[PDB]
Design a protein around this ligand. Structure first.
Ligand SMILES: N#Cc1c(-c2ccc3ccn(Cc4ccc(CN5CCCCC5)cc4)c3c2)n[nH]c1N
Ligand SMILES: N#Cc1c(-c2ccc3ccn(Cc4ccc(CN5CCCCC5)cc4)c3c2)n[nH]c1N
Lengths: 201, 216
């Protein structure tokens, strides 16, 4: 059983019994009627003010909440992270936009609850929303009650456009197939992700 | 400058957010067009089957090459860059995003179940450029979330399309100068801009050492 609350200024993006997922429009906690301002010390782009975030998260979080903050400067979100989070009761995902969220939101929250700044990969997005969907998919499929690269998979027909299924897969020989697949996985891994086997990227 | 993106999926609804993210101005200026196609349009049977049991046995199902073959034959040309999300792909990185941002036609083939019969990509690669890629070291249910990430990372590099304008970036601060007892670091208000740049550099170095020591 898990509850996930996503907090965003772009709730429209997210519209698509063991688990519930709620999307909250951060603008509902605004004081006047602008969440962003210019960065201290200068620099391009705008920064989300901590004030609106503080009120929102106050209402939504408890001290047992795991606060997840997507950021391109975060710790790596990996399958190990996903296993770790799959047994949590309550995740709140704070989605930023502009050039991100004032650092004091995460620093303050970390005095009241567990906080995790994470990145889903080494590319730049426009905000936390797409990252939130990745994190949610990766975690929810591991919730109770739901190393190497995988080799190639095949199905019918056995011959297609003159291209044949590797004959070993039609042999019915379990041990030869397990061997052949173990081989394919290791060959794909060394070619595409040599770092996984301890070699230079 | 301008890009056509075709996405093929059995869940075209999952692609609603990319349409939600596209500004009307960029569409009307003909800078971008994103079409989403239901794979089942190309099925052959009354049950609209897209999957079948794996040769060699195993759990899960494999997506049928004949259905994918027809769909891609229709949508792709020899000038297409065919992108295939997969948990066994080459890493998709910012370098990848930069390279693809200058393409004229991207087609993203989103798999489900255990993935797509390998002959589909192998066949396609004999007449177009094909890229099997993974967006990170975690496991998803299919290619659709990866296509959202890929499309966003690529399109924000195409000038004027999404509306937007090595170490990890350090922390940022804005108003108010004091909040819940935490002050913005005084150096940022010192007006000494060489010292500010040095302070930011050192924050970046510390954060990188702590969060991503591999980058060093
Ligand atoms: N997870 C994850 C992510 C994200 C992600 C997550 C959350 C937010 C909230 C806002 N943005 C956009 C953004 C983009 C660039 C920069 C750095 N800039 C570089 C120099 C000029 C100024 C700042 C900051 C903020 C976000 C991006 N991107 N990539 C991932 N794997
Ligand atoms: N990009 C990207 C991705 C994807 C991604 C991309 C495309 C598809 C199409 C289907 N799936 C789901 C799936 C999940 C697991 C497995 C491995 N199996 C499980 C155990 C038995 C052996 C085989 C295969 C297929 C996809 C996942 N995941 N993570 C990324 N970074």
């Amino acid at each position: 059983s898990m509850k996930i609350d996503v907090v965003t200024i772009f709730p429209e993006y997210l519209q698509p019994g063991l688990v519930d997922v709620a999307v909250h429009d951060l603008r509902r906690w605004t004081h006047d009627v602008s969440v962003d301002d210019s960065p201290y010390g200068g620099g391009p782009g705008m920064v989300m003010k901590p004030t609106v975030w503080g009120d929102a998260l106050d209402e939504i979080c408890t001290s047992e909440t795991l606060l997840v903050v997507p950021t391109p400067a975060g710790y790596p979100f990996t399958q190990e992270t996903a296993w770790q989070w799959s047994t949590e009761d309550h995740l709140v995902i704070a989605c930023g936009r502009y050039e991100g969220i004032d650092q004091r939101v995460a620093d303050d929250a970390a005095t009241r609850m567990r906080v995790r700044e994470v990145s889903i990969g080494d590319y730049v997005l426009n905000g936390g929303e797409a990252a939130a969907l990745v994190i949610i998919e990766a975690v929810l499929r591991l919730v109770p009650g739901v190393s190497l690269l995988e080799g190639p998979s095949y199905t019918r027909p056995p011959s297609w456009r003159g291209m044949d299924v590797p004959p070993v897969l039609l042999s019915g020989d379990h041990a030869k197939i397990a061997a052949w697949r173990a081989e394919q996985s290791r060959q794909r891994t060394i070619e595409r992700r040599p770092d996984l086997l301890g070699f230079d990227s």
